[PDB]
């Protein structure tokens, strides 16, 4: 690639999450941006069905 | 979101190599207090935008545990071991919820990562580690909206070097 | 398909008590060679006909193992332990898949059974056993059509009695 | 009385959707059994993702 | 104390076939709350009297759990699956310790049973079940003397029959 | 014949040594049962490390 | 041999703090192919010389597996998570045997480390990582004599730093 | 401690290992030396009973 000047510095992403945990159905959407080669990213996740979640959001962190 | 990893020491990047087609992953997380969380994910690339589609099934979380009590604190950082199996990548990692009160609740993630490219078009990495730092920067609304940050580094165990030249 | 159980001795029938609303179940099965099979199910009653809706996520099955190679033999019978937890029912069972070469590939089912009725409307059973025999009666079409039979009995440990008045 | 909604012989039908090791599939099925005798039979048809690339046995307990 | 089993139906008795030399067993029991209890045993015959020698290593039991708090209730009965592996016998069983507050603390025994006779001298059993009821009959002295009873039966799944001619 | 070495009623004796969660203990025991009927009883005595600081129940299957 | 660890970033050294009296540890290692290896160890200090006393019980290793076939290659490096539980230290780590042929056989170590000093005399470390590099430098004689090297570093996950100032 | 000049640079150790794995009894002894603050060490282990081991030595590595 020569140098970092020819790599994409940032890349957006969108997500949809659907599931059931202990019998509770939920759906989420999400939007974020990251730096693919620096290995960092940030996103906002919203629960659009089944909110507020009756369990800790943390069990969904690795799936987002 | 495995496209966003900083690989050092020349470790091949299975995820970035898989585009434009992308990749999937599949995972079961087993919690020490009985809970299971299984997920399947598709990653594709729609022009310049990554698109994730995830399905989740979780069960057997104890009603008195930190998850169903909504009494989780925050995730510790973690280090996944990643290696080739059956011509795809396997990962395993032990994560730990630091609950409010000091006590940790651990879990064990078992993952397969599958390129949509054929294995012969890919340079597979050897056994290595992926540090993951995931953090809730803001609970915008309690069980409805969250801002999350992650940093991830693919590396070898350089702090305790081999006396034989192994990674 | 837990509505089909012959209960003996005193034992309350959680499933047949749950109508007409029905019940759900949630399960993760862990296989000794690394596979996971997670399933959620809904059981309803549509005028005389029971209706089942099932979602499955399975992962991490070894490419060289009997499941992914499609060289499994048959299921042995099994005995599930069943007891109340968190005002619903939990079950655990070890199953064993006979495979070529005299191998048994075992797995461990972790299930939660949830009535759609409130727990106050239910007579909850004590700890007991469900014997289950599941048999693939016919491979009608190699990987496209199968016929399956099951017999189940809910019972206490009659063969080896208590000396202290316990079931 | 809950059990009054059930009969000595009852039919059932099923719909199954899933992914195993990256492989998507869908099934339907129809059976009949005697709920109080604890016996049942069914026929399952893989309508999508067939012929399955894995042993059907792993779906037995979900049907 | 596996010499004490009533076998029914055709089932060969691995243990009573092993005399006068005897047999050993090796086991790790995993508890759902993190405890491990590993044991090795030797069974010999000293003129009409069976002699048992046992070594135990247990670890990781939670300080706040029923075991370390000494606030366990009693064992439910259980059903072990037993089958030939590597020319010796393997067993697996889920046990459940009743504890205060309507809790069941379950564990999973993984055992290998090894005759001291060569496998060529033995009639090996097919896959079967051993029902076991173990009961602490008396706490004679709080944590210094106990009386314990056991009944066991080796059997097939008689309650739920095969339609294909299988045991 | 192997089973000819056994009787309708037989005694047994045991010695147990172990460590659980850092706690060392030793037991002996003596029992009797009917091997072919599948029934047995025994008395276990903690001779070292007593009174145990954990539930005896975890030693039941080893005795 | 946990006295020989380089701690960085000011992490308290539970092991060095425990002398002169020393410490114990207790461990069960569960292998993915069914094997269990349980060990208890005592560490004391006899003048200037450390003395270790270890007891081991291992079982259920498959006769066809790399361990009982004596077909293990070498251990990968690994990273243990270490944290306080019940006023002592718990550790968990996933290790991987790199077998001859490329395939990895993994295992999961569950350890408790117990100081012989009372917890009030100790500064306990927070959640952190221990890198371990263990290597056979020489098979002097095949199943009889070995020279082994280890390097170990206690650290935090610094490669992927927190955006909130957490370790 | 002031500086490294007042720390013990090296410390010897001795070990005894006794156990049974899949029904095979063995005993080992060992001798080694390490640097406690650099976090390195080396040892020689000898099987004095039950050798040669009928299983891979590697399952004993973390116990030595």
Curated annotation (Swiss-Prot), chains A, H:
Superkingdom of source: Eukaryota
Protein name, UniProt field: GFP-like non-fluorescent chromoprotein FP595 chain 1
Entire protein: shown range: 2 to 62 of 232
